[PDB]
Design a protein around this motif. Structure first.
Motif, mmCIF file in Angstrom:
data_model
loop_
_atom_site.group_PDB
_atom_site.id
_atom_site.type_symbol
_atom_site.label_atom_id
_atom_site.label_comp_id
_atom_site.label_asym_id
_atom_site.label_seq_id
_atom_site.Cartn_x
_atom_site.Cartn_y
_atom_site.Cartn_z
ATOM 1 N N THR A 1 0.825 -1.206 0.000
ATOM 2 C CA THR A 1 0.000 0.000 0.000
ATOM 3 C C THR A 1 0.863 1.261 0.000
ATOM 4 O OG1 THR A 1 -0.166 0.117 2.423
ATOM 5 C CG2 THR A 1 -1.812 -1.218 1.265
ATOM 6 N N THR A 2 1.872 1.267 0.865
ATOM 7 C CA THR A 2 2.818 2.373 0.946
ATOM 8 C C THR A 2 3.499 2.604 -0.399
ATOM 9 O OG1 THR A 2 3.767 0.776 2.515
ATOM 10 C CG2 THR A 2 3.749 3.095 3.172
ATOM 11 N N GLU A 3 3.800 1.515 -1.100
ATOM 12 C CA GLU A 3 4.448 1.592 -2.405
ATOM 13 C C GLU A 3 3.502 2.168 -3.458
ATOM 14 O OE1 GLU A 3 3.941 0.473 -6.073
ATOM 15 O OE2 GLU A 3 3.980 -1.518 -5.153
ATOM 16 N N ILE A 4 2.214 1.859 -3.338
ATOM 17 C CA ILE A 4 1.216 2.431 -4.234
ATOM 18 C C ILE A 4 1.085 3.928 -3.970
ATOM 19 C CG2 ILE A 4 -1.212 2.432 -4.956
ATOM 20 C CD1 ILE A 4 0.355 -0.049 -5.832
ATOM 21 N N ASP A 5 0.913 4.303 -2.706
ATOM 22 C CA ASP A 5 0.818 5.717 -2.355
ATOM 23 C C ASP A 5 2.109 6.434 -2.743
ATOM 24 O OD1 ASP A 5 -0.251 8.091 -1.353
ATOM 25 O OD2 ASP A 5 0.483 7.709 0.680
ATOM 26 N N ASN A 6 3.225 5.720 -2.643
ATOM 27 C CA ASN A 6 4.500 6.241 -3.113
ATOM 28 C C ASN A 6 4.425 6.506 -4.614
ATOM 29 O OD1 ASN A 6 7.195 7.062 -3.121
ATOM 30 N ND2 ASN A 6 7.960 4.970 -3.407
ATOM 31 N N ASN A 7 3.940 5.521 -5.367
ATOM 32 C CA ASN A 7 3.731 5.701 -6.801
ATOM 33 C C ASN A 7 2.849 6.913 -7.082
ATOM 34 O OD1 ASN A 7 5.201 3.358 -7.036
ATOM 35 N ND2 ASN A 7 3.457 2.070 -7.624
ATOM 36 N N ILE A 8 1.795 7.082 -6.290
ATOM 37 C CA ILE A 8 0.939 8.258 -6.416
ATOM 38 C C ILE A 8 1.752 9.528 -6.179
ATOM 39 C CG2 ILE A 8 -1.054 9.513 -5.479
ATOM 40 C CD1 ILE A 8 -1.797 7.062 -7.125
ATOM 41 N N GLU A 9 2.592 9.523 -5.148
ATOM 42 C CA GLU A 9 3.478 10.657 -4.896
ATOM 43 C C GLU A 9 4.359 10.915 -6.116
ATOM 44 O OE1 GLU A 9 7.370 10.226 -3.687
ATOM 45 O OE2 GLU A 9 7.086 11.969 -4.992
ATOM 46 N N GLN A 10 4.838 9.845 -6.745
ATOM 47 C CA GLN A 10 5.615 9.986 -7.975
ATOM 48 C C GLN A 10 4.762 10.618 -9.075
ATOM 49 O OE1 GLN A 10 8.402 9.540 -6.788
ATOM 50 N NE2 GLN A 10 7.496 8.322 -5.133
ATOM 51 N N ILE A 11 3.520 10.158 -9.208
ATOM 52 C CA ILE A 11 2.607 10.704 -10.212
ATOM 53 C C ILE A 11 2.354 12.185 -9.945
ATOM 54 C CG2 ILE A 11 0.250 10.650 -11.161
ATOM 55 C CD1 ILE A 11 0.234 7.614 -10.655
ATOM 56 N N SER A 12 2.283 12.560 -8.672
ATOM 57 C CA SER A 12 2.123 13.963 -8.305
ATOM 58 C C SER A 12 3.379 14.745 -8.678
ATOM 59 C CB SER A 12 1.833 14.106 -6.811
ATOM 60 O OG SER A 12 1.388 12.880 -6.258
ATOM 61 N N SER A 13 4.541 14.165 -8.394
ATOM 62 C CA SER A 13 5.802 14.771 -8.803
ATOM 63 C C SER A 13 5.800 14.977 -10.312
ATOM 64 C CB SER A 13 6.990 13.904 -8.380
ATOM 65 O OG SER A 13 6.990 12.663 -9.063
ATOM 66 N N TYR A 14 5.294 13.989 -11.042
ATOM 67 C CA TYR A 14 5.175 14.106 -12.489
ATOM 68 C C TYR A 14 4.156 15.185 -12.836
ATOM 69 C CZ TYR A 14 7.371 9.513 -12.045
ATOM 70 O OH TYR A 14 8.201 8.471 -11.701
ATOM 71 N N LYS A 15 3.085 15.272 -12.052
ATOM 72 C CA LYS A 15 2.108 16.338 -12.238
ATOM 73 C C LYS A 15 2.800 17.681 -12.020
ATOM 74 C CE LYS A 15 -1.927 18.333 -12.750
ATOM 75 N NZ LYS A 15 -1.592 19.696 -12.251
ATOM 76 N N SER A 16 3.835 17.685 -11.184
ATOM 77 C CA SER A 16 4.687 18.862 -11.032
ATOM 78 C C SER A 16 5.643 19.018 -12.218
ATOM 79 C CB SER A 16 5.481 18.790 -9.725
ATOM 80 O OG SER A 16 6.543 17.854 -9.807
ATOM 81 N N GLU A 17 6.157 17.903 -12.733
ATOM 82 C CA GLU A 17 7.094 17.942 -13.857
ATOM 83 C C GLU A 17 6.403 18.265 -15.182
ATOM 84 O OE1 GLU A 17 10.945 17.226 -13.159
ATOM 85 O OE2 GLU A 17 9.543 18.319 -11.868
ATOM 86 N N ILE A 18 5.588 17.324 -15.661
ATOM 87 C CA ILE A 18 4.885 17.439 -16.944
ATOM 88 C C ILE A 18 4.283 18.829 -17.173
ATOM 89 C CG2 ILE A 18 3.064 16.449 -18.421
ATOM 90 C CD1 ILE A 18 5.445 14.580 -17.739
ATOM 91 N N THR A 19 3.855 19.486 -16.098
ATOM 92 C CA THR A 19 3.349 20.852 -16.199
ATOM 93 C C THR A 19 4.476 21.800 -16.595
ATOM 94 O OG1 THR A 19 3.382 20.714 -13.769
ATOM 95 C CG2 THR A 19 1.235 21.000 -14.840
ATOM 96 N N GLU A 20 5.657 21.570 -16.031
ATOM 97 C CA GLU A 20 6.840 22.336 -16.398
ATOM 98 C C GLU A 20 7.243 21.991 -17.828
ATOM 99 O OE1 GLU A 20 7.177 24.123 -13.852
ATOM 100 O OE2 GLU A 20 9.002 25.322 -14.068
ATOM 101 N N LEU A 21 6.892 20.781 -18.256
ATOM 102 C CA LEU A 21 7.196 20.326 -19.608
ATOM 103 C C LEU A 21 6.268 20.969 -20.629
ATOM 104 C CD1 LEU A 21 8.794 18.268 -17.928
ATOM 105 C CD2 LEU A 21 8.192 16.564 -19.650
ATOM 106 N N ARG A 22 5.006 20.536 -20.634
ATOM 107 C CA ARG A 22 3.981 21.033 -21.561
ATOM 108 C C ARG A 22 4.073 22.533 -21.798
ATOM 109 N NH1 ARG A 22 -0.286 25.135 -20.585
ATOM 110 N NH2 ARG A 22 -1.911 24.739 -22.152
#
Lengths: 110, 104, 110, 104
Positions: free
Chosen positions: C2-23
């Motif tokens: 579960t922690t690893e999934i929520d971690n993955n979500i944190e990664q997806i949020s980080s990407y939500k931080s990244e991809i926005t800087e990208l696009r």
């Protein structure tokens, strides 16, 4: 008379109504010419653009016709020069014809 | 005060009637100067156009007169090479005949 | 886990931080070229303006030198033509000199 | 949901890394195309300039060669008119001498 003075004031107020319409239509008039002058310079710019556009189109192709006229004249003299070379060989060919024609007549006469 | 104000209002129209009518004489000049220019546009625009096609068909008539003269030469060289290879054959006629008189 | 999934979500949020800087930097990149293309067309317009400006300056004065060369040649032939007329009269002037020179000698001899 | 979202985020970078690097290869081309054009500006700008003054001094040298030839003619005509009015005077010499032999 006092009434006549206040009347004059009323006239001055009417003028305050007029002169305002005056001073301002000049502002509406002054801008009207700003619009013309802004247009004029843009026309004499398109003019200098067209005249400049065509003149260079002429100059650039009138250089190709000239390079064609030279390239043409170059082979026109080569054709004539080869027209001679063709006659020289022809003079010999028909001269080679009279010999075998009469070399024949004598081995024939033999 | 009064008279000065009565006077203050009639200088505003006296001077104005001069400026605006000199500018109306100028607004008319400018819009006349562009008519002079618009005609100059249509002229040089129309002029250069016919002067252009005059060189287009020129070059066309001329670049066609070359393609004909270009192959006309190559034709003569096929003609020249032809009667040339006959001539050589004829140089072998007098040759074989020159050997005959050697054999008598 | 579960922690690893929520971690993955944190990664997806980080990407939500990244991809926005990208696009977006693409939007800052896409406009950067809009600025170049907007500049390019303006240069090849100034080019066509200069080349057009000079070409017509040449064509217009090269027409004046030609009209000068003709106007020159026009009088150069007139000078020669008048050079003759000057000699013709001279031939007569000196011929009128020998006559009065010897019309003299005879009224003298008289 | 999840995996689709994990996947939804990596298509955004995969495709992007292609577009932006093809556009970076294009931003470089455009700014190269203007250098090619700016050089073409300086060339035709410098070229026409010297080609211009070449016709300026030409016309100048020539329009001076005319002013000399223009007065040189007017000079000869003052010379021609001079020895012309002497000649006429000489036509009055033989005249007065022709009248003498009439009087013997």
């Amino acid at each position: 008379l006092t009434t006549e003075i206040d009347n004059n004031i009323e006239q001055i107020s009417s003028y305050k109504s007029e002169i305002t319409e005056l001073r301002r239509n000049v502002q509406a008039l002054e801008i009207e010419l700003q619009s013309q002058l802004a247009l004029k310079q843009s026309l004499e710019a398109s003019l200098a653009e067209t005249e400049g556009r065509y003149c260079v189109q002429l100059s650039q192709i009138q250089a190709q016709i000239s390079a064609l006229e030279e390239q043409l004249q170059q082979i026109r003299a080569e054709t004539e020069c080869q027209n001679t070379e063709y006659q020289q060989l022809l003079d010999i060919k028909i001269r080679l014809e009279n010999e075998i024609q009469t070399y024949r007549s004598l081995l024939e006469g033999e | 005060r009064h008279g000065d104000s009565v006077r203050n209002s009639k200088i505003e129209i006296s001077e104005l009637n001069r400026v605006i009518q000199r500018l109306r004489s100028e607004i008319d000049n400018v819009k006349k100067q562009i008519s002079n220019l618009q005609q100059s546009i249509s002229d040089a625009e129309q002029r250069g156009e016919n002067a252009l096609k005059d060189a287009k068909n020129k070059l066309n008539d001329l670049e066609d007169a070359l393609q004909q003269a270009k192959e006309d030469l190559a034709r003569l060289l096929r003609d020249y090479q032809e009667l040339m290879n006959t001539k050589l054959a004829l140089d072998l006629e007098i040759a074989t005949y020159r050997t005959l008189l050697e054999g008598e």
